[PDB]
Amino acid sequence: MNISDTQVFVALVVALLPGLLAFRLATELYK
Amino acid sequence: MNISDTQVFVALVVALLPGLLAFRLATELYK
Amino acid sequence: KLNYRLDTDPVQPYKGDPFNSNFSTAITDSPLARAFINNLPAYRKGLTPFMRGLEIGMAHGYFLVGPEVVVGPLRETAHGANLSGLITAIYIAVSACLGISIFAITTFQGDPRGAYGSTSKDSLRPLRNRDEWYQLNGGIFLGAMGGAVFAYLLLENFDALDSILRGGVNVN
Amino acid sequence: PRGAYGSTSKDSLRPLRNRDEWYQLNGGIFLGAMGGAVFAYLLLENFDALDSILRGGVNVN
Amino acid sequence: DMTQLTGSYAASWLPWIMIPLIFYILPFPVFALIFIWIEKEA
Amino acid sequence: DMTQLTGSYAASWLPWIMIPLIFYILPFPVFALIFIWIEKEA
Amino acid sequence: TLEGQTPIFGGGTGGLLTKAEREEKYVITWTSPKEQVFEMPTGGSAIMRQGKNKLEIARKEYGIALGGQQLRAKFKINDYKIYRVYPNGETQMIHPADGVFPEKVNQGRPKVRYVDRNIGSNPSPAKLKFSGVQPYDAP
Amino acid sequence: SFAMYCHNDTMRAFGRPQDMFSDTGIQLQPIFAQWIQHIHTAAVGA
Amino acid sequence: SHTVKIYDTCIGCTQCVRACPTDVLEMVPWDGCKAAQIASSPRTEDCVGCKRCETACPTDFLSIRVYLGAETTRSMGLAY
Numbered sequence A, B: 001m002n003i004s005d006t007q008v009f010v011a012l013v014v015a016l017l018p019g020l021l022a023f024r025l026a027t028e029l030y031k
Numbered sequence C: 001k002l003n004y005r006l007d008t009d010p011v012q013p014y015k016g017d018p019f020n021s022n023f024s025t026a027i028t029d030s031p032l033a034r035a036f037i038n039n040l041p042a043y044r045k046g047l048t049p050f051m052r053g054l055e056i057g058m059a060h061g062y063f064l065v066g067p068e069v070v071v072g073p074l075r076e077t078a079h080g081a082n083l084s085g086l087i088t089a090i091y092i093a094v095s096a097c098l099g100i101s102i103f104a105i106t107t108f109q110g111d112p113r114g115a116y117g118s119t120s121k122d123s124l125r126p127l128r129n130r131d132e133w134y135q136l137n138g139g140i141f142l143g144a145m146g147g148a149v150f151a152y153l154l155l156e157n158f159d160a161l162d163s164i165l166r167g168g169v170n171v172n
Numbered sequence D: 001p002r003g004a005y006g007s008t009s010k011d012s013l014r015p016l017r018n019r020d021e022w023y024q025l026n027g028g029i030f031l032g033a034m035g036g037a038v039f040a041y042l043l044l045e046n047f048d049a050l051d052s053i054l055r056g057g058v059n060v061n
Numbered sequence E, F: 001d002m003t004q005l006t007g008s009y010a011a012s013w014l015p016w017i018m019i020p021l022i023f024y025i026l027p028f029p030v031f032a033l034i035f036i037w038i039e040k041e042a
Numbered sequence G: 001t002l003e004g005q006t007p008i009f010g011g012g013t014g015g016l017l018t019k020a021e022r023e024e025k026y027v028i029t030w031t032s033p034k035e036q037v038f039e040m041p042t043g044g045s046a047i048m049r050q051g052k053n054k055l056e057i058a059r060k061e062y063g064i065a066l067g068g069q070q071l072r073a074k075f076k077i078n079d080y081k082i083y084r085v086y087p088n089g090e091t092q093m094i095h096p097a098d099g100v101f102p103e104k105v106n107q108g109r110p111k112v113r114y115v116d117r118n119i120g121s122n123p124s125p126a127k128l129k130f131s132g133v134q135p136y137d138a139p
Numbered sequence H: 001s002f003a004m005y006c007h008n009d010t011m012r013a014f015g016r017p018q019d020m021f022s023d024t025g026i027q028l029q030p031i032f033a034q035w036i037q038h039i040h041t042a043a044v045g046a
Numbered sequence I: 001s002h003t004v005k006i007y008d009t010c011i012g013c014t015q016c017v018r019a020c021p022t023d024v025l026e027m028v029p030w031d032g033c034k035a036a037q038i039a040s041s042p043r044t045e046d047c048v049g050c051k052r053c054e055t056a057c058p059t060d061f062l063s064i065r066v067y068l069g070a071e072t073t074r075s076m077g078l079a080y
């Protein structure tokens, strides 16, 4: 039994935080 | 038995030769 | 002893300048070729950039529908093939318009490099202003969409148009 | 013009300071909105064909 | 059948397109070309 | 059936939307953004 | 303006491009004792006239090659000059710089980019790390 | 030529032989060479 | 632009100046060699980096050195 719709959506929402932090780190390194 | 598809297309291509020469003569006469 | 025989040369220097990297040939300088090229919408005198873009878009979006209609992967059915052709034309035209937009964005900063600088004398590239490029792009997009839709409507109504052009609508 | 569109106004958020700019804007708004609405309408009208398109169902024949 | 225009001759699709082209598609652009030609300032 | 792409996993419409988005929808805007970034005058 | 008559040439594809009108251009002028055939720097043959000749070119190397390998070496013409022409019309005579050919030593010419040592005494790059100076530019 | 060969490769890998450039798919008949063959055969009376 | 340097081993043989296809070098008075002249590169902006001068230099090691640097329109040898 694989994960459900809610788990996929929760993973997608959680992955936003590393994405934003990666953008912040990239812009800081570009400085 | 009338002419075929190829004969009609050949006649159309051949008719281009007097067509272009007519344009050359008309422009030459306009000079 | 030396006779260049330039006065009797069928091929002359382009516009009287022998050092402009061009020749006066039947393609570049004949009256018919000059008239045809200079009266195309890209070069027609007095046209506003939007009208140039509109005419070019109508023509290009009109003929871009056909290839996927005839030899595309949805060609087994008429309606699907027409939809695929319209979608392909729309995608190509939108990509081209995005390219035109970014070309205008990047070319016109300060004095543009290359053929679009203030001192450039490129007669084949007359759109020297960014606003002209944006008007041209708007015209291109609208005309391309209109031509693609016109071709799509003609192909979707192929049976009706075939009856139309054969007088089959005059039975009743 | 009164308010933020006067000659002495410095409203950076409202840069269209000419009447001709607003009419050019409006022409683009109308034609763009009609085209975008029709584009969405055409995709929804062809939802069954597009669903087969995006699933490879058009490659059966 | 005799309910539509048809052609038993070769390439019967040619009148299907040539008749519209010569009689109500191209003539207006041709008139436009002549109008520009006869109205050009010296 | 095996005549179309399907998914028995949860939210099988997700590939249906994301494959076009990542591979032939967003990439051209991303290329445009990069082109604007690398062509900006100093 | 630069005086001289262009050589007899029917045209070619190796001439000037957008760079000539946008960034810079070069002009080579000379004087010949007679009308004679020479080779254009970018292909083809031209006829230089008896008077003073002026030729428009895209790169300085074209003019240097024409003046040295053809005008001096073959036609024994030594009065050629190369000018750089900018789009705004500003013209500077760049060859020869001071009226004397560079291969002939001339008084008043300063030493430029001279290093007061043999090439084997350049410092190692580890010496100049983060200092921004290259070993050949080191004092 | 070569991109069309690659197209044929990809279409065959997909299991879409009907989309290939072939005698049974999208045909590319060399009609001029066939015509020359026919003329040269009929010239001698065969 | 490229960088052209002349070291004190120059013998004033004028070969590098003659070999240059863009007139970057010239001979200037000097007292460090018998020929009483040394090469100089006042016009390195016109240097293309062909290294013909290095090929023509007879000293061992080279008395003239070319270090390729930032590329410009004329250093890339572009007619366009």
Ligand code: F6C
Pocket (backbone or CB within 6 Å): C062, C063, C065, C066, C067, C068, C069, C070, C071, C151, C154, C155, C158, C161, E020, E025, E026, E029
């Ligand atoms: C790949 C390849 C390829 C392909 C594939 O294979 C194709 C296809 C195809 C198909 C789909 C079609 C047919 C269909 C039939 O048959 O049937 C219907 C018809 C009808 C309906 C028709 C009816 C009548 C009409 C309407 C008339 C016309 C009009 C005009 C246009 C106007 C004119 C204006 C001025 C005067 C000019 C078509 C068409 C085409 N085109 Mg193609 N294509 C290609 C190409 C091209 C190129 C390059 C070029 C040049 C640019 C081109 C052009 C053109 C033109 C003009 C055209 C027309 O018109 C048509 C139409 O759209 O239509 C609607 N292509 N297309």
Ligand code: CLA
Pocket (backbone or CB within 6 Å): B011, B012, B013, B015, E014, E015, E016, E018, E019, E022
């Ligand atoms: C002067 C000769 C002549 C005349 C009067 C006609 C008359 C006609 N042709 Mg026709 N035709 C001709 C020669 C001629 N043909 C030749 C030589 C060819 C082979 C290239 C064709 C191929 C042809 C096709 C394929 C079709 C017609 C069709 C037609 C009919 C409709 C008109 C049309 O679509 O034209 C079409 C004409 C062409 C595609 C090419 C015409 C080429 C000729 C030589 C041009 C003559 C120009 C003329 C001499 C200059 C006039 C000067 C002015 C001062 C009057 C009409 C009865 C249509 C038809 O059958 O409808 C039922 C049709 O579909 N023609």
Ligand code: CLA
Pocket (backbone or CB within 6 Å): A011, A012, A013, A015, F014, F015, F016, F018, F019, F022
């Ligand atoms: C680096 C890890 C990684 C990799 C290589 C893949 C690879 C793939 N994923 Mg995926 N995914 C991941 C993590 C990853 N996943 C995570 C953590 C999630 C939960 C948020 C998802 C959620 C997800 C969905 C919902 C779907 C895919 C799908 C796919 C496939 C098509 C690509 C696509 O649509 O991306 C979609 C990607 C996302 C929606 C989010 C990706 C988030 C990751 C963490 C970003 C990684 C960035 C990377 C590290 C930076 C690269 C730097 C560069 C220098 C290389 C492909 C096999 C599709 C599929 O199954 O097709 C059959 C699909 O529909 N993925």
Ligand code: CLA
Pocket (backbone or CB within 6 Å): H029, H030, H031, H032, H033, H034
């Ligand atoms: C331009 C490149 C090109 C080249 C080098 C060839 C070469 C060849 N073709 Mg070929 N062909 C081409 C394009 C080309 N083709 C195109 C575009 C088509 C589609 C109409 C064909 C259709 C075709 C057929 C049906 C056959 C060949 C055959 C052949 C072979 C015999 C030569 C011959 O007389 O064929 C005749 C070829 C033609 C009449 C094609 C016309 C080519 C013209 C000159 C080019 C015009 C289109 C141009 C690319 C677009 C113009 C751009 C615009 C800016 C002006 C030979 C290897 C024969 C073969 O396979 O023999 C074994 C054969 O039967 N060709």
Ligand SMILES: CCCCCCCCCCCCCCCC(=O)OC[C@H](COP(=O)(O)OC[C@@H](O)CO)OC(=O)CCCCCCCCCCCCCCC
Pocket (backbone or CB within 6 Å): A019, A020, A022, A023, A026, A027, A030, A031, F026, F030, F033
């Ligand atoms: C679906 C995924 C699509 C691709 C990802 C998104 C592409 C575009 C993202 C950046 C656009 C805006 C640029 C910064 C906005 C902006 O103007 O920044 C300005 C910033 C600093 O610029 P300067 O130092 O020249 O100063 C100019 C001043 O105006 C600002 O300081 O420079 C950059 O462009 C940042 C570095 C390049 C970009 C680094 C990598 C990009 C992000 C990588 C991580 C992505 C994570 C995604 C999570 C969802």
Ligand SMILES: CCCCCCCCCCCCCCCC(=O)OC[C@H](COP(=O)(O)OC[C@@H](O)CO)OC(=O)CCCCCCCCCCCCCCC
Pocket (backbone or CB within 6 Å): B019, B020, B022, B023, B026, B027, B030, B031, C031, C032, C035, E026, E030, E033
């Ligand atoms: C389907 C058929 C549609 C109708 C036929 C085509 C209509 C348009 C054709 C000409 C357009 C461009 C005009 C010349 C291009 C052009 O600019 O020419 C310029 C030419 C010379 O002009 P000037 O002497 O004032 O010098 C101006 C300079 O720019 C050129 O020397 O004057 C003309 O207009 C030519 C004479 C009038 C036209 C004579 C009759 C037209 C041709 C008749 C035969 C047609 C055969 C068709 C075979 C396919």
Ligand SMILES: CC1=C(/C=C/C(C)=C/C=C/C(C)=C/C=C/C=C(C)/C=C/C=C(C)/C=C/C2=C(C)CCCC2(C)C)C(C)(C)CCC1
Pocket (backbone or CB within 6 Å): A008, A009, A010, A012, A013, A015, A016, A018, A019, A022, A023, A025, A026
């Ligand atoms: C479900 C849901 C939702 C939605 C969501 C979404 C829409 C999501 C998305 C997500 C995503 C879409 C994400 C993404 C992410 C990303 C990432 C995670 C990335 C990362 C990256 C990295 C880490 C790297 C970086 C770097 C650096 C550092 C530097 C250089 C450059 C680069 C880039 C390489 C909502 C809320 C509406 C509602 C509820 C439910």
Ligand SMILES: CC1=C(/C=C/C(C)=C/C=C/C(C)=C/C=C/C=C(C)/C=C/C=C(C)/C=C/C2=C(C)CCCC2(C)C)C(C)(C)CCC1
Pocket (backbone or CB within 6 Å): B008, B009, B010, B012, B013, B015, B016, B018, B019, B022, B025, B026
């Ligand atoms: C089939 C085919 C094709 C097509 C073709 C075509 C499209 C054609 C057309 C054709 C045509 C469409 C033609 C036309 C012609 C014309 C003519 C032949 C005319 C003539 C005229 C005349 C002779 C007269 C003149 C005059 C004079 C002299 C002076 C005054 C004016 C006038 C005009 C009266 C192609 C190649 C694609 C491919 C292969 C197959």
Ligand SMILES: CC1=C(/C=C/C(C)=C/C=C/C(C)=C/C=C/C=C(C)/C=C/C=C(C)/C=C/C2=C(C)CCCC2(C)C)C(C)(C)CCC1
Pocket (backbone or CB within 6 Å): C056, C096, C098, C099, C100, C102, C103, C140, F031, F032, F034, F035, F038
């Ligand atoms: C068609 C048309 C035309 C034209 C147009 C144009 C002119 C366009 C342009 C366009 C353009 C102008 C485009 C562009 C594109 C771009 C691209 C495609 C890019 C890409 C990129 C990439 C791929 C990147 C990469 C990288 C870098 C570099 C850095 C960082 C890392 C990476 C890897 C991201 C005209 C007007 C005549 C007329 C109408 C039609």
Ligand SMILES: CC1=C(/C=C/C(C)=C/C=C/C(C)=C/C=C/C=C(C)/C=C/C=C(C)/C=C/C2=C(C)CCCC2(C)C)C(C)(C)CCC1
Pocket (backbone or CB within 6 Å): C058, C059, C060, C062, C063, C142, C143, C145, C146, C147, C149, C150, C153
């Ligand atoms: C050079 C020449 C030629 C060629 C030609 C061509 C290439 C043509 C093309 C043509 C074409 C390709 C055309 C097209 C056209 C198009 C049109 C005419 C369109 C129109 C459109 C419309 C009308 C639209 C409308 C709309 C809109 C706008 C929106 C809403 C919807 C609708 C749809 C209503 C030939 C070889 C013959 C001969 C020799 C010379």
Ligand SMILES: CC1=C(/C=C/C(C)=C/C=C/C(C)=C/C=C/C=C(C)/C=C/C=C(C)/C=C/C2=C(C)CCCC2(C)C)C(C)(C)CCC1
Pocket (backbone or CB within 6 Å): C090, C094, C141, C142, C145, C146, C148, C149, D031, D032, D034, D035, D036, D038, D039, D042
């Ligand atoms: C901020 C952001 C975001 C958001 C976003 C959004 C809100 C989006 C939207 C989007 C959209 C909402 C889009 C849309 C688009 C559209 C289009 C792309 C259209 C197109 C169109 C067309 C192409 C048309 C055409 C036409 C015409 C013109 C006429 C005739 C007909 C036709 C149809 C052809 C997110 C949260 C994610 C993340 C974070 C950040």
Ligand code: SF4
Pocket (backbone or CB within 6 Å): I004, I019, I020, I021, I022, I023, I024, I025, I046, I047, I048, I049, I050, I051, I052, I053, I054, I066
């Ligand atoms: S590298 Fe070439 S152009 Fe530069 S100084 Fe040496 S020979 Fe002259």
Ligand code: SF4
Pocket (backbone or CB within 6 Å): I006, I009, I010, I011, I012, I013, I014, I015, I016, I017, I038, I039, I053, I056, I057, I058, I059, I063, I064
């Ligand atoms: S650098 Fe070399 S070639 Fe030039 S003058 Fe000195 S020894 Fe001669």
Ligand SMILES: [Ca+2]
Pocket (backbone or CB within 6 Å): C169, C170, C171, C172
């Ligand atoms: Ca009726």
Ligand SMILES: [Ca+2]
Pocket (backbone or CB within 6 Å): C073, C074, C075, C076, D058, D059, D060, D061
């Ligand atoms: Ca299919």
